[PDB]
Amino acid sequence: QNPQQLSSNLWAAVRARGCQFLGPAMQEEALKLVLLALEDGSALSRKVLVLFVVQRLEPRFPQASKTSIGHVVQLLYRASCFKVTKRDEDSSLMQLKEEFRTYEALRREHDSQIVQIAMEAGLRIAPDQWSSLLYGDQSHKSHMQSIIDKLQT
Numbered sequence: 001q002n003p004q005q006l007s008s009n010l011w012a013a014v015r016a017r018g019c020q021f022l023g024p025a026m027q028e029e030a031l032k033l034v035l036l037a038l039e040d041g042s043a044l045s046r047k048v049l050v051l052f053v054v055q056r057l058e059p060r061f062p063q064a065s066k067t068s069i070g071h072v073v074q075l076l077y078r079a080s081c082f083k084v085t086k087r088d089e090d091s092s093l094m095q096l097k098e099e100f101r102t103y104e105a106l107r108r109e110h111d112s113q114i115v116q117i118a119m120e121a122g123l124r125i126a127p128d129q130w131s132s133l134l135y136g137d138q139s140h141k142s143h144m145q146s147i148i149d150k151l152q153t
Contacts, residue, residue: 001124003129006123006125006129007129007133009121009123010114010117010118010121010123010125010133013117013118013120013121013123014075014114014117015071017074017078017117018071018074018078019071019072019074019075019078019117020068020071020072020074020075021072021075021114021134022061022068022072023136024134024135024136025061025136026057026061026064027072027110027134028107029057029060029061030053030057030064030069030072031072031103031106031107031110032103033052033053033056033057034049034053034072034073034076034096034106035096035101035102035103035106036056037049037052037053038094038095038096038101039096039101039102041095041101042095043085043093043094043095044093044094044095045091045092045093045094046070046073046091046092046094047091049073049094050066050069050070050073051066053069053072053073054066054069057069075110075113075114076106076109076110077094078113079109079110079112079113080097080109081096081097081100081106081109081110082094082095082096082097083095083096083097108143108147111134111143111144111147112147112150112151114134115130115144115147115148115151116151119151127141127142127144127145127148128141130144130147130148131143131144
């Protein structure tokens, strides 16, 4: 019902699932760096994916850390964005699935997972507040409405 609490309850739900949203400006840049590493089909351990991202993000966003970026990667993992190759005694490697090798499609699956988390947590958030929470503006409402429509069958 009440908006300012919907927001703190959303981000606590996200964090309860081992995930993080870093804020609209920082999330967008973090997601572009994941794409920069993985859009060509490269296959990176979780460790090296995090290192690539943190090292390129931290200069513009000095609070970036391996912990916080690991949480962002977990969100994409929960969203089923990666093909994971398991290697027994060796670290698993992660690639972006082909479908998610462009920013708009990756960011859509990311946002959709956050809406799914809100639904799991019993939080009823309208497209305008979604646009505010994920983009910091009122220009992504039709995008958010499309995600909601698709999650109600």
